[PDB]
Amino acid sequence: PVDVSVSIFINKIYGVNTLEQTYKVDGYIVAQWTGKPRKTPGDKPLIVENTQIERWINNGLWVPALEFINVVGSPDTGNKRLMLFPDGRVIYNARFLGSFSNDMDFRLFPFDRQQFVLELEPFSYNNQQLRFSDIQVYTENADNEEIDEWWIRGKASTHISDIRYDHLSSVQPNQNEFSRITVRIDAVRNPSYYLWSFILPLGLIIAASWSVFWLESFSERLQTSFTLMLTVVAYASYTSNILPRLPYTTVIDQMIIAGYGSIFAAILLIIFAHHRQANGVEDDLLIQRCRLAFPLGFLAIGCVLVI
Amino acid sequence: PVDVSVSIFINKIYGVNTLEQTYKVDGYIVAQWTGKPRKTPGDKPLIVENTQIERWINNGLWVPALEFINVVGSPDTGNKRLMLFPDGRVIYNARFLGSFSNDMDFRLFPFDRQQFVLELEPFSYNNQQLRFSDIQVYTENADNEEIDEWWIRGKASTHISDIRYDHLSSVQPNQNEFSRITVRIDAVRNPSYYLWSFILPLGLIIAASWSVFWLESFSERLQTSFTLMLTVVAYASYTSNILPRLPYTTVIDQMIIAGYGSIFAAILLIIFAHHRQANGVEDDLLIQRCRLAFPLGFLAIGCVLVI
Amino acid sequence: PVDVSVSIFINKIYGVNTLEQTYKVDGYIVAQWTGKPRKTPGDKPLIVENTQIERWINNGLWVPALEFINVVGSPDTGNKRLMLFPDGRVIYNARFLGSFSNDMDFRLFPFDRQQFVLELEPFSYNNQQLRFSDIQVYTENADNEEIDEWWIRGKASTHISDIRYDHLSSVQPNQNEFSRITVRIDAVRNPSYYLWSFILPLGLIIAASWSVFWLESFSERLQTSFTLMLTVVAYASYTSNILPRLPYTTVIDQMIIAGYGSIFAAILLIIFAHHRQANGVEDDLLIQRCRLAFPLGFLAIGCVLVI
Amino acid sequence: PVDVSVSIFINKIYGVNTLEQTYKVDGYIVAQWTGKPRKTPGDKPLIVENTQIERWINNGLWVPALEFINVVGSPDTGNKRLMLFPDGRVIYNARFLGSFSNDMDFRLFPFDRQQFVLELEPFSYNNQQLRFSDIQVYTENADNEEIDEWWIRGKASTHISDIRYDHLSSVQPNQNEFSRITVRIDAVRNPSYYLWSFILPLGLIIAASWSVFWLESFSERLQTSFTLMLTVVAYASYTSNILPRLPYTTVIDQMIIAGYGSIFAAILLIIFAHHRQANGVEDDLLIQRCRLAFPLGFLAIGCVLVI
Amino acid sequence: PVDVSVSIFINKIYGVNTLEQTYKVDGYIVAQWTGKPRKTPGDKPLIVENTQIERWINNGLWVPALEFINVVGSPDTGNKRLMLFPDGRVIYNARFLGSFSNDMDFRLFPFDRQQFVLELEPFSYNNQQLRFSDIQVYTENADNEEIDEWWIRGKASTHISDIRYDHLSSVQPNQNEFSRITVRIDAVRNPSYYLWSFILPLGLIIAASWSVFWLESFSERLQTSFTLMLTVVAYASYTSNILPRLPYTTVIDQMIIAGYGSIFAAILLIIFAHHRQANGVEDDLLIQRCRLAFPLGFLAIGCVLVI
């Protein structure tokens, strides 16, 4: 079984697509293995770039296809190169930009943790033909973090394995296991942008909603919460157009719902305060002073939803 | 008449385009048939990957083209492999990402059931030349529905059938029946996002809109439903920028129509109250107390849409 | 002059681009013509799919280029096939997805009728070298209009003709008339979404706008109309995001202008009623009670605009 | 010095990209010149389409690359044809779709004049090797401007010229002047949509804004002007959502500023009228009667911008 | 150790993607080196364009791969040309369009400085095989700045340097230093559009927001701030849709934040004015008349944040 040692050089992980559960990786693949010795010009190793690799492949050089298992679509490949050594060994070297796929839970956006994954597995040779001897991953990364959207935690965690397929070809003995390289990079979303620009004003809006109770008349109280209502809606629209599209609510969505809830609840209180009476216009001296009651009741429920 | 057995491996179904009635599928086709026996190197099956498959084809390897009927555009193809066994049999193996077309009725959005379909048919060989002998489809599926946009339901439907074409070339005898593979994968929409961030708050606005009748004055009543009206427009737009583009109204779209509708009737009821009089400002104590009438009048007419 | 019979199978018409005056057609071209007898294996017709076709051309098979005249950019091609008959004939068979160009008037959107057109014409052989003997077009059609954006109406129209070019090569006598196929498909827009979701509420807004004259006070009357004005802009904004970019107004675009007018009209009337006085509030004791005047005076300007 | 005559057929100029200063051109290029005499089948001119052209090149057919200087990216090419006449002459014919670049000032949008440009210059041969002998451009354009985004005006400006490059090899004699073909086609924007749906309603907003002064009270005067303000903003968003992206202001932009300009001046005045006093409520009965004063001042400042 | 001279001709820098930290460059690479003498037709240099360059490479011509280290995806290449001189020297010539990557801090948008960078480094040859001898960059730009999005300011920076890779393949002796060309171009953003259309009206919004204190009553003061609140929100959304998506805040973002705060600050000030009393309605003469106070209190907090 030919031992292929692999190297991934990750140049950029960027472009996350939340709806698609997809992220873009720019980098190099390096694959190395040893064949039967060759005679090269001089006796210094031989270089074969791009186009000529196919010419070499035609006259019979084994360059096994290594497919990116979790790539969506087939990757943009840049220069390719062969280094042929006389002692037999072969080095395949190529640049790639691919859009990769992984399960991505975004429900605690903008406080989500994600993991970028690469899965590599030979397209046609099983573990008895081609086996992954090792893999190094160079994440040429560090520092300058707050300008950066995602905070990389690790330094590329790795797992080589054997994948067994129960449903394949006309194959019986044990030729149904392929070797797989799985590369993981752990990350955390930098939530500041959402804290200052989405969370904060959404809060100031919700906060001032409560100031409806500092209004003198009932006509004033009831008529204003309609504006307040229009404002939360105005805010949702501002929000939605900019934030990632998901098939679920985020923490920010729920704050909006809660704002809708708060204002619609005050509507009930404002209306109820008025018509529950011992005459007709008995505004409950005590209930009308829930100006401090349910800002902190919202503050209590604010903590209860987080548990 | 050659028996061709096929396997589809579905990796990801994603990117539904509502306006286009379209969705993306990543996966593998495996097609197999038996030829006249070959003398292969050693005696184990010969592997041929990508660039070299053409070379075998140029020298007369029969590799029949199996086209994806309902593909829009020509699919992105990944690695291809030919495996030539010595006893005659040949297996074609390839990866694809393609956009497939199928009738997609989105009218009960966000509660639609959709069906992702793949249709397979030889491009040049009819059922007397090439026949589909059987087909399994593996949906490497499980888990995390709650994380996903669509929830797949069945295990996948399969049907081999024979399609007869009545109008073609100058060929008649019986070369007009092609053998067809049809794959069906059932799905349901994840409704929850739309329930909580569209339906519910649109629902609160509708109700709180009705609180306009709890206003004491006539002037307050009428002037206020104009803000209520402006709110629904603002809401409608929020919805519009976010929801899928269609050529018909969805259940949400209708909720907005009703919202506009409730508000406009309220204008009428409120004006009717005022100027229908025995003085000038005799607001029908009873009709202004339709504070209970058309809130539950809306629920009756809302439940009439269920037939 | 080689007689070529053509067949187009129209699979999908989708992707209208109103700014570009463009649409997408998925389908197959079939071209048939007769050369000199060939020897085919057995004596049964010979099949040549995709890759092998070019190779036949290298050995001199005449496969003439038939160009899509009105295609924007060059079409995505699927599988190509040649059926070479021993009796002399050749049949060319191809799938295409193309972005096609045609004049499209959108002024009565969402009630426009459009016609999707294909224009076929040889790239290198004139009508005395190659002539279109005929052309039939199959629109595999039926059902589900209510599901679709466009309603195909006809069954497809035809035109075989001669296009005369006055300025060409160093050759003058008659290498200037090429034969052209024109395929025409009629369509109507499914107007229902824009009917219920844009027209109706836009109407209810305009309608309820007129209820300004039912307000007792002048402040009520003049200030309320400012809200109305804001509502129409909000409505304008709501719309624009969804409507197609055109360089002219549509029907909806006019209802909007009509609205701004009706509102701007009342601002003036409300100011006029009040400040044309012999005191300060000498409202033309009746004019303010034009609650029927320019609502139905507006309706009059509406039917005349349909001239 | 090979005389090459060039002919361009322009089919569609479309898809202007304002941020990029880019527009699309679909059409055919035709280049003609005479080489040394050839023996053709019979003695009738020989046609060489697509694939077969390369074959002719590999055997030494001189086919010079003529590059589109101002093309962004490389053009989409459709069919190509070589016509080889026996007397020596060669005719190259190919269809193209390209994104072309030219300086585009959009500041008087929507009343801008633009010029679509093509620049053709050999990639490898200087004016002493390959010279452009003449060039005609056919603009198969006409009719129906009212339907189209752009109004093509002229019949196309043409200039064959000599371009001198100062920095190349160790060459002294004269190898540094390349011959260039330049096509100019003038156009004007169809302003109608923006006139009717951007300028007119905008003016009415501005106009109806000045009616803030016909309000009786001060509250009304100040409080309403905030409503007016929100309106200008709402209008601004609707506009931006739709208007082309630029790095400078357009006429419309300036209008929006003016709307903001009108309102903020009005607020100042309304407060000034109120508190500039000899009492407390000496509202300047006259300055609050600047109801026609700064409508003609906005009109004066509007017409002065042309000076 | 082969000396390579390089030239970059920058035709266009355009299409910055703020989220991707990406920009587009159109231009030509010219690489020159000296090989072993050739016999060319006559003795004048031989020109070899496009398709034919591979053919020369197939026969063993060394045309080394020079990679753009920082390009995202593989560049679109136009014409390629090989110039083979008889004295030995070889000149490679090509047009390119690529999307390049580089670090871009966008935080003081729209007054940011950015730098468009090109990085070139041989794909397979280290500094002992292939060395960069010198490099020029020509930016055929000038004039018309006030029309363009970025104002290129300096000329262009160049640095030939040696990159040492400590961890590669299994090669150690000295094969780990590659020579790298680095091109730097400084640019500043055209701030004008944002100053006039975004900053300016926002100032007018914020300022006129403070005139809420010139209102006589408490109701006028409190309720009107809710209108002010809705206005700033509307301004935010209008802005959002238009400004470049970043994962962190800009100057304008903060202005919006500030604007929100200003409004929320005043709600508190206004309510406090009402309820901090020695009667019930002691509206604090200074705090009610803080009409000069936090208009200039906002200017104090505004300038220190600039420091």
Ligand SMILES: C[C@]12C[C@@H]3C[C@](C)(C1)C[C@@](N)(C3)C2
């Ligand atoms: C057995 C195989 C066949 C092809 C599809 C699968 C999914 C399964 C991956 C693989 N590497 C290639 C191995």
Ligand SMILES: C[C@]12C[C@@H]3C[C@](C)(C1)C[C@@](N)(C3)C2
């Ligand atoms: C007869 C055929 C020829 C080509 C077009 C059609 C539609 C009809 C499908 C097919 N599989 C391929 C079979």
Ligand SMILES: C[C@]12C[C@@H]3C[C@](C)(C1)C[C@@](N)(C3)C2
């Ligand atoms: C002669 C031709 C040459 C090329 C351009 C024209 C417009 C005229 C169309 C055509 N099919 C191709 C035939």
Ligand SMILES: C[C@]12C[C@@H]3C[C@](C)(C1)C[C@@](N)(C3)C2
């Ligand atoms: C001389 C040349 C060489 C190459 C680069 C330049 C810029 C200058 C354009 C050209 N067409 C191709 C001609």
Ligand SMILES: C[C@]12C[C@@H]3C[C@](C)(C1)C[C@@](N)(C3)C2
């Ligand atoms: C307040 C709003 C209400 C709705 C219409 C306006 C025009 C004004 C734009 C907006 N995005 C949504 C915000």
Ligand SMILES: C[C@]12C[C@@H]3C[C@](C)(C1)C[C@@](N)(C3)C2
């Ligand atoms: C040594 C190398 C090998 C390949 C990948 C790296 C990242 C490292 C860049 C390089 N130019 C090409 C040089």
